[PDB]
Every structure is written in structure tokens, then in C-alpha cells.
Design a protein around this ligand. Structure first.
Ligand SMILES: Nc1nc2c(ncn2[C@@H]2O[C@H](COP(=O)(O)OP(=O)(O)OP(=O)(O)O)[C@@H](O)[C@H]2O)c(=O)[nH]1
Ligand SMILES: Nc1nc2c(ncn2[C@@H]2O[C@H](COP(=O)(O)OP(=O)(O)OP(=O)(O)O)[C@@H](O)[C@H]2O)c(=O)[nH]1
Ligand SMILES: Nc1nc2c(ncn2[C@@H]2O[C@H](COP(=O)(O)OP(=O)(O)OP(=O)(O)O)[C@@H](O)[C@H]2O)c(=O)[nH]1
Ligand SMILES: Nc1ncnc2c1ncn2[C@@H]1O[C@H](COP(=O)(O)OP(=O)(O)OP(=O)(O)O)[C@@H](O)[C@H]1O
Ligand SMILES: Nc1ncnc2c1ncn2[C@@H]1O[C@H](COP(=O)(O)OP(=O)(O)OP(=O)(O)O)[C@@H](O)[C@H]1O
Ligand SMILES: Nc1ncnc2c1ncn2[C@@H]1O[C@H](COP(=O)(O)OP(=O)(O)OP(=O)(O)O)[C@@H](O)[C@H]1O
Ligand SMILES: [Mg+2]
Ligand SMILES: [Mg+2]
Ligand SMILES: [Mg+2]
Ligand SMILES: [Mg+2]
Ligand SMILES: [Mg+2]
Ligand SMILES: [Mg+2]
Lengths: 461, 461, 461, 51
């Protein structure tokens, strides 16, 4: 009649929770070579990554540089929201404008501008070449870096320095092979694209082709632009922020909260899904139970993010006494999401590449990376030397249950330097490929069927 | 036939005991904002606290200053009993006389007293002003701190310094608004209250109204005086101590023993309950099993205190080999006390605010704070500096099973400094409100229904 | 319906894995004296060792010197494969040529050779005596170390220094006692063996009788030569390497891979068994499950080697998240191998002699010793002194799942010195004999039936 | 500054420059730290003989 651990209710202690350190992946029959294993996986219902890694929406992890680097490596970045709406939207714009199959609204100047104005425009948009259009809107020339580097008088007008029409151009609908042939024949880096009337429509650069060859794994939309995501909260400020981000061209909106089994979070997910769901994907915030995942799935989430106090000495566990070991949390959330085709993003608690393999094996489709990327070169911050070691030096945060509320006021900074993002991603992917080879998993979908062995406390000594 | 751990008896090892570190609170469906979470809870069957915390009856934790500070913060203090009966009764009187709606036995002098005598009475009662009455008992004036501060001659009598009658007074039963309006209209801090014959009956001060505004959460009786509790042992000395404390105006008596599953303790609880039950509440000492709690409930205790060797390296565990992990002990005691409506106080083993949340979720109604408050400014002792650090420098104890009977003779002292009490209480309540937000608990009674997840040893690495 | 550790699939967490530190051997009724316990056990179906220990096929552990020392101690060595095929075959020849009952193809010189050429041959083969043969092929004399140490001019020919025929010889089929009598009556160290025509066919030395007396536990074939094993990989290069090693006289082939539950490895084992199985034994790579052991048995393996990520902080566990605790892995593999009489080799995770006893009690027939032997005098490398301490200073590695693929490019070396191999082997065998005395096991086959007790984390504190 | 004050005209810098980016070697990461990786010397009295 009594429960052995106390009391008379068998459900007072609901489950035994397993973390990453409690389990290992068992070897199985394999004909899979690690170099031939396919590591592509679904981020949402409509977005498949080549490398199943996403960078966290933390102000020490993901800004435009990290987002570009992650999308180039085959994953994706989620821009943090600890900043004004205009600044986050501009970061989305920066990521989307990094590269493309064809620039569809290129920056143009007029013949009357000075060279100082053109230099300012180039610095503002981080480009080096501008088509020149007159008051009619007609393309009268093009001014690039070569023309301006040899000029001293910055007050000179553009019409005096630009390469005047007729130019080397192509019509709308020009094939990529023809465009590159025209670029290589005339030994120029730029090719304006014009309509039937000759007015400018677009611009094609050799640099875009070189980037496409240099980063074959890039995460891109149908226009050849890198994908990016951004985080929003709950409220009306958050609704305005979400609409601005959608206008800027974002691909994924993450309703990013500490505790997503809340009616406000679910209403925000449903509102976003009905309002802008045909264009962007909506990812629901952090859950740790089967019921919360099912609630998010009913609300209409395209992916479910999992983890609530997942770390051992997490501030949520110490201060509030709340948590859920991550392996059991992922198993429970997958049990709710998998029947409906909704992917799962494992967020938090990861320390090594073996943890990534374990989390994917438990049923998650992607892993979100935080502290593993905070010290990298692409993460925000300035690089400084202190005593021969290297470090990275640096109104919002309205979530009532975030860890920054639970910690006392003080100081945090000087995260150590970890090097380029490429090496970290290469190491993590190598570990994942080794695990796939051991378990005989040709794909991530097969890895999600692998078996575990539970180890005792003696196995961690 | 054999038990897997040895022997033939399956009841030799009765249970598996869970401590605080073994469990976490699982997130649940919530609409609760931490700021609007109601943290009030029952201390006994008749006393409800705004903050469900009480300070321990230890000579390093609770004296009159700590008790006043705790009752002002919404909790309560229990005065320790490691001191003579007269001194503990004096501390009870000090706490009860700190503030009131109206002072009912005001300190008065006679016109023949010198200013030195009035100064001595002021220092004795820690007040600054006195009404003056003659042998007839008529109110002949009032002498306050303003009159005395400008007198160089200490040897003068009161009749030459006091403000003579007629005074600004009020009738018995005057309302709060009328009394405060009369105080403000005449720009005075004191208002004597007189009967139909004009003989002095009470005193109303502006400082009491200001205190009521300044500490809105204070734990008070119907007269507006702060509540306080005090500990007693067992024996006839303990009976005399209890009667003296009840005379001094104590609100809670705690029969404080290391092992309450004793006929002496139970008979003492029944005796106190029969003699002074209608006036004060009786709390039974520390238990750790369902049977002991049931025995205390039958004896008539108004609250049951839980914990016998709850600390991991406790002296009781090391020296006597006796103990009970606190989560299981709380579950077992609640299983016996809740059907009868007797609240449970969790005493010992608490290190973080998360532990307080876990103890309340296991079924307890209040938590008793020991070492968490010993370094605070309001705890007894003198603050000193040693080596750049701050430390707090400092016949009875008939409990045969207490830890001081187990520990050898030596030196204990110099507890470290921890700052003001209010900051510690604020941190603990913030943790509790975060836990209530995560679990979706609007009240403490709902928090007592929250579920746990048991974690493995790997979750503590 | 739901699994307590998460999800709905009860086989997601397949088992609970036990390591060496989780178990102890229980004392049982014994009449066994440790000195008289029989420690011999099967390495394969056809090879029985006197001491159930084999040295790892690592380039810091086993080369020719270690193989000879292990065979002389009563175990065996396995030569590593991180070197060219010619060098490994040469080390096989070195081990096989160390000692014998009779040298079947003794090295010879000709009367027209210079003493420098004879010195070169002696240095090459590490001998000190050669019979002399003419162009006819008749034995004309013998030149040994005594004849060469007293000649100053190294330019003199063999015919002027050698002892001329007639010599002391014996006919093919001469017994050992007769040959030793011939050696001792004429006070010589060598005895050529000739056929009816008078042609040289063999050689018998006093040194071989002395070695047989000096190392009575040696692991030898029917010709009195030490047994040796060698590691091969998978692929066509591996097939050529294996054929060369077999031609050099190897006794055991070990298909040495990280993950043997692979069709390629199984095919290699079957091919080798079909080709050279009647001469040599083929041992299959590392497995950790019952199914993998059953596959290796079906492939035709003569013994099964067990262990995949067995160490607690193993690189395979951290980087790939893959492993299996060694006690459970051994139990599972033995369940598949014992019905067919296939011995099990426990490889990895051994730290103490008690672990060797536990591995054998779980069902293994032999244990492979790695890092326990890496710093011994007989292990490869050169002994140096650094800061008062003693250290050991020093295209292939094609296995896709080997740990070196997982470790980052970097630096390793300077293993510490651990004394001679004899003391290590003596200590390990002493521990094993004590375990046999405690469990009442006269043979290793009886030790394989002993029981375990599982201990808690407190038992490791 | 002290060396130039004593009368020297220039100072030769050795170990102060050994770890800089322009010095020979390859930059690597080891455990979160950064390091630089890599018949002649016939001088009879050089330190390399003594060590
Ligand atoms: N010219 C131009 N490029 C843009 C614009 N917006 C984004 N880009 C991108 O910026 C890159 C081209 O920038 P530039 O530096 O002017 O190109 P470039 O002169 O070919 O560059 P290099 O080969 O590095 O000399 C391409 O990846 C474009 O897709 C824009 O308005 N104008
Ligand atoms: N005057 C007076 N106050 C008492 C007595 N017993 C308790 N008190 C409390 O002590 C406080 C008043 O102390 P005083 O020092 O006289 O206060 P005050 O001079 O009016 O106040 P401040 O000048 O603002 O400090 C109130 O909170 C009273 O409730 C008593 O006998 N006389
Ligand atoms: N002489 C000789 N010994 C061989 C040959 N091949 C293997 N051996 C072994 O090498 C050992 C003999 O080596 P030697 O040094 O020539 O022997 P020895 O001169 O009799 O020995 P010591 O004078 O006691 O050192 C024996 O163990 C032989 O079995 C060979 O071709 N010639
Ligand atoms: N489509 C075009 N038609 C005609 N002239 C062009 C065209 N595109 C560029 N030019 C001219 O070709 C010249 C070379 O410029 P280009 O754009 O190739 O390089 P850049 O970016 O200016 O220089 P850099 O070599 O520093 O990257 C310039 O004078 C430019 O005006
Ligand atoms: N009820 C009263 N009627 C008439 N005079 C009074 C009354 N109470 C106090 N006084 C007088 O009014 C003056 C101001 O005293 P009050 O009680 O306001 O403050 P205090 O405690 O004397 O001084 P402090 O400003 O230091 O608090 C004194 O001279 C006092 O004697
Ligand atoms: N079978 C033999 N018949 C005749 N003479 C022999 C024979 N074997 C060796 N001798 C000769 O006997 C002498 C001693 O040879 P032996 O083999 O006993 O020792 P060794 O190996 O030359 O020297 P050491 O004494 O250093 O071990 C040599 O001069 C050698 O030529
Ligand atoms: Mg350019
Ligand atoms: Mg260029
Ligand atoms: Mg005053
Ligand atoms: Mg005042
Ligand atoms: Mg010899
Ligand atoms: Mg000799």
C-alpha cells in the first residue's frame, strides 16, 4: 500500500529521468562508412538542413556574422532578441543580402552624387559597385571600386568617373550559364540585368558563383539567399517585432520562452501560424513533457524545442528546484510529436559531440548549440589578450521565468576564445558520423531508431 | 525466499529515502505569473503567514531582534530556550511590545521623578516619551524627548519640564481615522486615550501608523502586535517555563525535542493543549515517520515538525547512525497529518530556495530556516572584522538526544556575516515564486500537488 | 503503458550495463591452495596457454621482444600492424626463430667469404656460429665465435679460421638425450645434423636445452618454437599482409578492427578460414553484443575478442557517444560463443588483477593486456631519464572507426617506465590465484562458473 | 629602457617574440589554449650542447 519512496500516491514521483551521462549508444550491424553517412535532417516540416546544427538565440552566440557562418556550414542561426526591433530586422536583412543567385534590388546612385556619397553608400551596404540611374530611371553607367580607387578628388561627381553606357548587360530570364559566359568573356565582375524597356531589374556577380562553389553545403531558399531565423517573445511588442522580422525576409520565427506550456505562448503560436504561416515557419518554445509538446503541436507549431533546466548545476534547478533530465524529456516530447511529423530540436545540456549523437538517437531531429559556440571567432564580441590567454569582450528580456531573473545582479563577461566556427562544426560532425558508423545508421532517420544501454555510477568514475 | 539485499525479512530495509538532491519539480501547464503568485500558507490550524518561512529556535539564529524582523517580513521567529526562563519571557515581551494598534499599558512616570529616572525608564523600555500621573491617578501631563533634550539639569523633577494639562487626548474606542487626524492636526506624535472619568487608558502614536505602512506584510494578532513563538522542553522546569511564556504573551509554544516519538513529549503536548490550548497553539517536535506524526496528531498538536538527521553529513548520522532523508520523511508525515488538517513544518536540510520549493511540494506547509539565517545582521552576535573578512562573534539543554550531547568538547563560533535578513528572504521568495510559475501553482495548496521527477547520480555531476 | 525512463518503446533502453567496478566475486566453499591452482586456459580452440594473458596489438606494447617475453612467460604476443608488411613479417620470423628443438635451416657461410661478411651475417640473424658449405654442398667445417674472437685481421677467409671437417655430427632422427650426450662429451656448444649422404640438414645447440630448462612454461608448437600472433585489417592490402604473415610462420591471425559487426570483417574472417584455417587460427575483431558474437561464430572464428568503448572516459564514449560496459558485454558474448566451444578474449578496461579475475569469472577465457604493459622494459621504445623520472621514448591505421580517427591531430608520447615484464606478470597471476583460492576454483573452467555480488556507489567511495 | 640607459644602442629580442604570429611555426589549439608547432648548430659552447 505505501509507496517505497514515501506517501500513498504512486504518481507523486512520476518518472526516473535520464540525462546524457546515463546512457551510451550500443553498436549494431553496420555497413555504413562514416564518410558516406548522410547527416541531413529536418529543422521544420519544410526546411531540411545538411548539418543538423542550429546556433542558440543568445546575445553571446548568434548575430549576423554567426548566422551567415552557420548557414554557410550547412546549419542555421537564430538571431537573438535582446535588442531593439530595428536592429534585429537589420541583422535579418544583412544575412539575407549576404549572397544570392541574382540581386533583385541592387543599390544604385545618380550621376550627380559625389564620390563621398558613394563611399558612404558602399560602407552602409558593404558593397563595392553601383549602377548609376538618372531621373528618368535609365541605366547610364556603372561605378565600381576600380574607378574610385584611382581618383583623389572625392568631391568629383559620379558622371565624371563612371563607366558610361552602353554596358555589358543581359535580359531578364538570362540563364546562369549564359550570364557567367558573358562575365568571363568581357573580363568583368558585374552584369546588370534589364527589362524590355532597358530599365534596370537586377545584377549578377561572379562573386556569387564563387561563393556557391566555395560553400557547397549552404542552407538557401529558392532565390539562393541564406536562410535565417529570429526569436520573439509574447505580447504586443513581440507581435510588432514579428511582423517587422517577416517584412525583413526572415524564414523561421521562434517563440522563445522559458516555459512554453502557457496559454499565452500557445495563443502567440496560433496567431503567428494563421497570420504569416504560409510564408515562414513557427517554432514553439521550450517544453519538457509529453503534454506540453502535444499542446504545442495542437497550437500549430512546425517544430518543438525541448529543454527546461537540462543542465546538472543549472540555475533553474538550484534557484527554483525545477528541471527535467534531457534524454527522458526528448523521449517524452518525441512520443507526442513524431506521429504528426513535427520535428524536435534538442536545446541545452550538450557538452560533447557524443551528446549530439545521443540526443538525435533519442528522437530529436536537430540540436541547438549554445556554450559550444560562444567563444568562436564568428560569435559577437572583440578579441583581446589578457595575461597571454585569449578572451572575447563585450528593456528587453521580458520573460518572467528566465534565468536572468533568478540570478542576483552582478557581473558576467570575458568568455574564452575557441577559434574558428569551422573547426568546431567539423569536430561535431565527425563525432556524429562515427556514431552513425557504429550504429549502422545511413541516415538521421535511421539513427533515431538506435538502442541505448544505461550505465551505472561506476561507469562515470 | 531471500531478500536480494540479505536475510529473510523483507521489512528489515523498510524504504528507500529520497533527499532534496534526488528530485526535481516537473513543469506543468501554467498561467501563473511569479509576481502574482500567492505565497501565503498556514503555520498552525489558526495562524496563516504571508511568507511560509519561520526562523529556527537556535541560540545563533533567533532572539527578539530576529523575531521582530521575521514577523515584519511576513514570517515568524521562534525564540530559543538556551537561556534562563526570565530572559526568554523578557524577549517575548520585547517582541510583543514592538508595535501595536494602541499601547494598552503605557509606561508612565510621576511628577516627582527626576529626569535621570525618566531617562533610565526610557532606556529600559526602549521608548522616548511618558505620560505623567499623580497619586490620584489623574493625567497631569506628558514628558517626551523634546522636553528633555533641551535640559542641562538632569536633577530637575518632571513637574518643571513636562507639558502640563490640558493635553490633546481622546475617548476610549476612538477610530483609527479620528485618532490619526487629531495627531496630525496638532502636529504631535502622541495621543493619550482616556475613559469616562478621564483616567489614562492607552496611548496612540504616529510611529505605529508609519510602521504599519512600512511593513504591510507583518504577522500580527488582532491587537496589531507582532506574533512570536518560543520553544520548551520536557519536565517540570519546562512546564514552569511554558506558563511564564504564556503569561508574557507568546502565541506559539513549540515542544522542541530531537525525538518526539516519546511518551514524555506526547504527554507534555497533551498537557499544554489542555491547559492553554484556547489561547496559544502547540507545535510538536521533530518526527521522521508516519507513525510518530500520527501519535503527535492524536496528542493534539496544532502543527508537526519534521526532520531527524536530515543533513547528509549530520552528526546524528555519523555518531549514532540514525537518520531519515527529508523528502521521504515529509511525504510520510503529510500522509498522516493532512487528513486531519494539521500543518507540517519542514526543519533541516535546506540549502537553496529550490529546496524550499521541493519541501513545500512534498506536502509541507512551512519551512524552518536554520543555518541560512545565522550570518544575517539580525541574528544574535556582534559584527567584527578578522583578516579582511566579516564574522559574527558570540544548565539548560536537557534534551538527552540532541547533537551537543554527541559532539565532543571544543571550539565553535565566528559565524560568517551574510548581510541583512530582507535580502535573504527576498531571494528565497523569488525562488519560490519562480517554482510556482513553472508548476502552475497559484497558491501553496496547489504547489502541494506538484509532481517530482527522480534524477540519477549523473544529474549531480 | 509508458516506460518509466521515457517514451513508449520498452526496448529503447535495452539493458543496464555493469562494469568491473560494479561487481565483486563472492567467496565460496574452497579446498584450493593458490600455489596449486591451474591457471591454464584456451586462447583458441586449438591453442592452450599456461598463463591466460595476451599482449595487445599496439605499437607501444608488442613487437618481437615483447612477443618472445610473453611466450616465455606462458602467454602470447600479438604483433601490431602499424608498419610495412615486410617489417611485420620480419618480426614474425624473429619470434619464430628465437629458439627451437632443432634449427631446420641453419645459416651457413662459404670458405671464400671474408670474416667481415660472417660478422655481418651474425649481426643480421643474431647468432654466433655458422657451418661452412662448399659449392658441392658438402659440410666442410664450422666457424664459431671462439674461432673469430682470436683473429685480428678481418680480411682472412673462412677456410683459414674455421674448424675443418671431420666435425662432430649426428644423423637425422637422433634423440635429445643422445645429442646432449654428444654435446657434453666433446665439450662443444653445437651439433650439425646430417643425412645419409653426409649433407647438412639441421643443427642442435646446448642453448636450446638450457632455454627449455630456464622457461618451462613457454608457449610452443610441436617443433619447440615460440607461438606468435599478428594483427591484420580488412581490404586487399590486408589480404596480401595476411598471406605474407602466414608464409613467415605465424600461428594466429587477428582481424583487428574497432567494430566487427560489419559484413566486410565477417567476409575477411570466412575467407581467411577457408584459405589458411587448417594451419592457423583466425580471431575476429571487437564486438560488444550477443548478435555480433553470433555473427563472428557463424563466420568461422576460432575465438572472439570483446570490447567496444569499455573504458569509462574512453574516447569512443566521449566523441561518438558509443560504448558498452565490459562485464555485461562479456556475459552477452559468452552466451553466444560457449555453446560452440569458441573462447572469448576480454580486451580493454582492465586496471588491476582483480579485474582480470572478474573478466575470467564472467566467462572470458583469456584477457588482452594493453596499457598495463606499455611502459615495461620489453615494450618497444628507448629508456631515458627526464627530471629524475624514467620515461620510454619513441599510411597505415586505415580503420575508419579507430580512436585515432576521433582524437584530434596533436602530440603524444613519453610513457613512463614500469620495470620488467616478469614482475607485472607475477603480480597479475598472484592476484588471479588468490581469486581462485577464494572462489574454490581449481581450474579456469571452474572460475567461469563463479558468482558475483553487485555493489552500490557507496561501495566505491 | 634600462639596457639603453646603460649605454647600449639597440636591444635584441628573443623569447619576447617567440610566440607571435609572425614567428615560424603553425598555430594550433590544445585544450582551449593556443600554441605554436614545428649538422647545423656547430657552436661548441652553445646551450644546446649543455642541456
Ligand atoms: N553589387 C552589389 N552586390 C550586392 C548587393 N547586395 C548584396 N550584394 C552581394 O555582394 C556581393 C558583391 O559585392 P561586391 O564586393 O561589389 O562584389 P565584387 O566587386 O564582385 O567583389 P570581389 O570579387 O570581392 O572584388 C555579392 O555576393 C552580391 O550578392 C548590391 O546591392 N550590390
Ligand atoms: N510611547 C510609548 N510607545 C510604546 C510603549 N510601548 C510600546 N511602544 C511602541 O513604541 C513606539 C513609540 O516609541 P517612541 O520612541 O515613543 O516613538 P516616537 O517618539 O513617537 O517616534 P519617532 O520620534 O518618530 O521615533 C510605537 O511603535 C509604540 O507602539 C510605551 O509604553 N510608550
Ligand atoms: N647457431 C644458430 N643458432 C640459431 C639459428 N637459428 C636459430 N638459432 C638459435 O639461436 C641460439 C643459438 O645461438 P648462438 O649464439 O649461435 O649459440 P651458442 O653460441 O651455442 O650460445 P652461447 O655461446 O651460450 O651464447 C639457439 O637458441 C638456436 O636455436 C641458426 O641459424 N644458427
Ligand atoms: N557590366 C559592365 N559593363 C561595362 N563595364 C563594366 C561592367 N562591370 C564593370 N565594368 C567596369 O569594369 C572595370 C573593372 O571593374 P570590376 O567591377 O571588374 O572590378 P572592381 O570590383 O571594380 O575591382 P577589384 O578588381 O578591386 O575587385 C571598371 O572600370 C568597371 O566600371
Ligand atoms: N498629546 C500631547 N498634547 C500636548 N503636547 C504634547 C502631546 N504629546 C507630546 N506633546 C509635546 O509636544 C512636543 C513635541 O513632542 P512629540 O511627541 O511630537 O515628539 P518628541 O518625541 O518629543 O520628539 P522628536 O521630534 O525627537 O520625535 C513636546 O514638547 C511634547 O511634550
Ligand atoms: N660440432 C663441432 N665439431 C667440432 N668442433 C666444433 C663443433 N662445434 C664447435 N666446434 C669448435 O669448438 C670451439 C668452441 O665452440 P663452441 O661452439 O663451443 O663455442 P663458441 O660459441 O664459439 O664460443 P663461446 O665459448 O664464446 O660460447 C670452436 O673452435 C668451434 O669451432
Ligand atoms: Mg570588386
Ligand atoms: Mg576583385
Ligand atoms: Mg519622537
Ligand atoms: Mg521624531
Ligand atoms: Mg657460443
Ligand atoms: Mg657461451
Amino acid at each position: 500500500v505505501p509507496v517505497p519512496t514515501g506517501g500513498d500516491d504512486p504518481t507523486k514521483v512520476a518518472m526516473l529521468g535520464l540525462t546524457f551521462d546515463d546512457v551510451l549508444l550500443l553498436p549494431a550491424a553496420s555497413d555504413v562508412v562514416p564518410a558516406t553517412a548522410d547527416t541531413s535532417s529536418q529543422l521544420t516540416k519544410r526546411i531540411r538542413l545538411r548539418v543538423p546544427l542550429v546556433s542558440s538565440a543568445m546575445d553571446t552566440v548568434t548575430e549576423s556574422r554567426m548566422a551567415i557562418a552557420m548557414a554557410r556550414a550547412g546549419g542555421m542561426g537564430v538571431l537573438h532578441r535582446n535588442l531593439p526591433v530595428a536592429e534585429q530586422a537589420g541583422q535579418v536583412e544583412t544575412v539575407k543580402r549576404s549572397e544570392a543567385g541574382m540581386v533583385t534590388d541592387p543599390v544604385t546612385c545618380s550621376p550627380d552624387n559625389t564620390l563621398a556619397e558613394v563611399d558612404a553608400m558602399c560602407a552602409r551596404f558593404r558593397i563595392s559597385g553601383l549602377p548609376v540611374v538618372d531621373d528618368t530611371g535609365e541605366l547610364v553607367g556603372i561605378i565600381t571600386n576600380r574607378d574610385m580607387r584611382f581618383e583623389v578628388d572625392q568631391s568629383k561627381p559620379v558622371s565624371e568617373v563612371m563607366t558610361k553606357a552602353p554596358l555589358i548587360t543581359a535580359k531578364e530570364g538570362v540563364s546562369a550559364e549564359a550570364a557567367l559566359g558573358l562575365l568571363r568573356r568581357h573580363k568583368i565582375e558585374k552584369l546588370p540585368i534589364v527589362d524590355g524597356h532597358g530599365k534596370l531589374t537586377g545584377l549578377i556577380t561572379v562573386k556569387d558563383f564563387v561563393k556557391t562553389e566555395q560553400f557547397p553545403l549552404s542552407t538557401k531558399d529558392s532565390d539562393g539567399r541564406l536562410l535565417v531565423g529570429a526569436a520573439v517573445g509574447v505580447g504586443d511588442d513581440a507581435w510588432t517585432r514579428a511582423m517587422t522580422l517577416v517584412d525583413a525576409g526572415v524564414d523561421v520565427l521562434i517563440v522563445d520562452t522559458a516555459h512554453a506550456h502557457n496559454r499565452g505562448v500557445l495563443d502567440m503560436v496560433s496567431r503567428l501560424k494563421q497570420a504569416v504561416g504560409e510564408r515562414v515557419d513557427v517554432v514553439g518554445g521550450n517544453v519538457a513533457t509529453r503534454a506540453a509538446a502535444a499542446a504545442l503541436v495542437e497550437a500549430g507549431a512546425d517544430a518543438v524545442k525541448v529543454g527546461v533546466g537540462p543542465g546538472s548545476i543549472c540555475t533553474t534547478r538550484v534557484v527554483a528546484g525545477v528541471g527535467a533530465p534531457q534524454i527522458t524529456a526528448i523521449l517524452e516530447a518525441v512520443a507526442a510529436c513524431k506521429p504528426y511529423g513535427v520535428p524536435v530540436i534538442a536545446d541545452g545540456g550538450l557538452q560533447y559531440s557524443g551528446d549530439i549523437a545521443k540526443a538525435l538517437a533519442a528522437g530529436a531531429s536537430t540540436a541547438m548549440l549554445g556554450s559550444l559556440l560562444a567563444g568562436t571567432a564568428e560569435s559577437p564580441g572583440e578579441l583581446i589578450f589578457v595575461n597571454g590567454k585569449q578572451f572575447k569582450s563585450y528593456y528587453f528580456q521580458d520573460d518572467v521565468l528566465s534565468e536572468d531573473k533568478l540570478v542576483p545582479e552582478g557581473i558576467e563577461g570575458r568568455v574564452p576564445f575557441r577559434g574558428p566556427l569551422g573547426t568546431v562544426i567539423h569536430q561535431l560532425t565527425g563525432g556524429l558520423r562515427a556514431a552513425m558508423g557504429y550504429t549502422g545508421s545511413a541516415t538521421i532517420e535511421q539513427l533515431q531508431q538506435a538502442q541505448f544501454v544505461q550505465i551505472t555510477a561506476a561507469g562515470l568514475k
